[PDB]
Structure 1
Amino acid sequence: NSMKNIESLFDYSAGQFEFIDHLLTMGVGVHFAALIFFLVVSQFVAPKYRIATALSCIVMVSAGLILNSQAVMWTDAYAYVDGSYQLQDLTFSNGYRYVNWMATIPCLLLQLLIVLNLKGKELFSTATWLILAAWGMIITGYVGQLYEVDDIAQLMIWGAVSTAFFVVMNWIVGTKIFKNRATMLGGTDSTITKVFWLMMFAWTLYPIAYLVPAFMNNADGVVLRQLLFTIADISSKVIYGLMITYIAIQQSAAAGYVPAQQAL
């Protein structure tokens, strides 16, 4: 996969190489620090909603482990030779991000459905279709980025197919949010709507990073992509988790869970 991504085409100045490295290690540090927060506040969440915060812990460790792996692969694959960082070993590719999305995107989608108060049949059926759509999005996206060096037309076709799953997924999410916000407690019917708009904005940065090879095929585009991934990661995983957890606690408290009431 390393020969198929644009990162393998370029030499990097020390500044470019260090910035990328620092983005990845900063992301590791943010995810594992939020992990502790989610772990600690899980005691303030009613049993009904506690799985939602537990899923955030899983997202944090999953996302953090891959960012840590990328950071090490990044420094293993390049060496400072004659004033630049040059490819030494085929060990870095973005594909690990995609495979990980197969795991974390279901987790992120499940926490939302839980705080929406969906139960039994509807929860299982709704989650099945959302996870199938998300996997379809990720799988077609993954195949497309295998062509970002050798076939930009193929990257566009796979991306268009991926974007159809994305659109259908967002329609299911949005429909369930607007049809069920009336069941939300503690005033969180107003909060869940913002989470939906946060999702739209944060998730849409990923297709933009996907397209960098088409509009910025150079070492600065490599940096920009990692920057957009970092903003998208923090927003779609951390800030999103913080809001899901807020909703979990507020509804727990409204539902008469004392640890939630004593903590608010």
Structure 2
Amino acid sequence: MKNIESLFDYSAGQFEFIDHLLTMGVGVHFAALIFFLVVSQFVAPKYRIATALSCIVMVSAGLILNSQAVMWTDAYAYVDGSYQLQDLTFSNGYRYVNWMATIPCLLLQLLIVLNLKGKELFSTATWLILAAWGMIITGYVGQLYEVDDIAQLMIWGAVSTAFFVVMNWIVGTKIFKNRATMLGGTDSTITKVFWLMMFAWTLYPIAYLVPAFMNNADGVVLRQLLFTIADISSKVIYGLMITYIAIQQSAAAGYVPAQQAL
């Protein structure tokens, strides 16, 4: 009721496209899960947790996308030529709470493949997770006002973006201070991962602002389209690059199953 999805009736095409986006996302994530599961054996024990975190991200994101898809079809019914709201079951907030768990996993596999260890990994991970949670919690409170108070959404978004900026500065600083430790030529691959993150993660605040510049049923479709692109890029494609780095460093470090896989 606090989100814009509940304000509109949807044509069969709008509704079915949203449903097909969420279901396609479920399919992509669970198919990648199998990939990450099977290739974890070609990863040296030092990096194997990284690929394991990808499996957790796939299932976590897949289950929430599957949840959203069923709530979507539970909330609406085709009545008099359009899908109209019938039950209070759909909300984007479930995406936000899920990020509390998936964003730490995404950040953690990055630090693992960067060769961080001991105190620094623990210290760096704690500040990154605290910043990320501050970003998500303020963003969560913000989207509660995307219908009733768009000014408050913009102010909470401003506070959330500050955490986002500080979070990226820590990530970027550690990447560029530690890329020289990376093996198998992955010191150049990790730089591409940082820019993939910058691009993919920034699509979320854009989707967050849709209610402010496209408050209509088409904006609801656009937001889900942006979520779908960001999810696939920040979770799947990102995970593939992390796994490639984990495997390439494993081989350069003398892990035979990795060398045999490459």
Distance 1:203 1:52 in 2: 19
Residue 130 of structure 1, CA deviation: 0.1
Superposition RMSD on alpha carbons, in Å? 0.1
Q: How far 1:137 sits from its partner (Å)?
A: 0.1
* Structure 1 residues 179-217: Cα deviation after superposition (integer angstroms, max 9, x where no partner): 000000000000000000000000000000000000000
Q: How many residues align?
A: 262
Q: Structure 2 length as normaliser, TM-score?
A: 1.00
SS in 1 for 2:46: coil
Alpha-carbon distance in 1 for matches of 2:111, 2:261: 24
Aligned pair 1:10/2:13, yes or no?
A: no
Secondary structure at the counterpart of residue 118 of structure 1:
coil
SS in 2 for 1:85: strand
SS in structure 1 of the partner of residue 246 of structure 2: helix
- How far apart are the structure 1 equivalents of 2:62 and 2:261? 28
Using the TM superposition, give the Cα deviation of residue 26 of structure 1 relative to its aligned residue in structure 2, in angstroms. 0.1
Q: How does 1:173-212 map to 2 (within 5 A)?
A: 173-212=171-210
Separation (CA, whole Å) in 1 of partners of 2:74 and 2:217: 18
Counterpart residue number, 2:221: 223
TM-superposed CA distance for 1:121, in Å, is: 0.3
Answer yes or no: is 1:22 the counterpart of 2:20: yes
Moved over 6 A (4+): none
Taking the aligned partners of 2:166 and 2:55, their CA distance within structure 1 comes to 27
2:261 and 2:210 mapped to 1: Cα distance? Answer: 44
- In percent, how many aligned pairs have the same letter? 100
Q: Distance in 1 between matches of 2:62 and 2:260?
A: 31
CA distance in 2, matches of 1:128, 1:210: 26
Q: Deviations over 1:22-54 (max 9, x none)?
A: 000000000000000000000000000000000
Q: Which runs of 5+ in 2 are unaligned?
A: none
Alpha-carbon distance in 2 for matches of 1:193, 1:203? 15
Asked if 1:252 is matched to 2:260, the reply is: no
Normalising to structure 1: TM-score of the pair?
Answer: 0.99
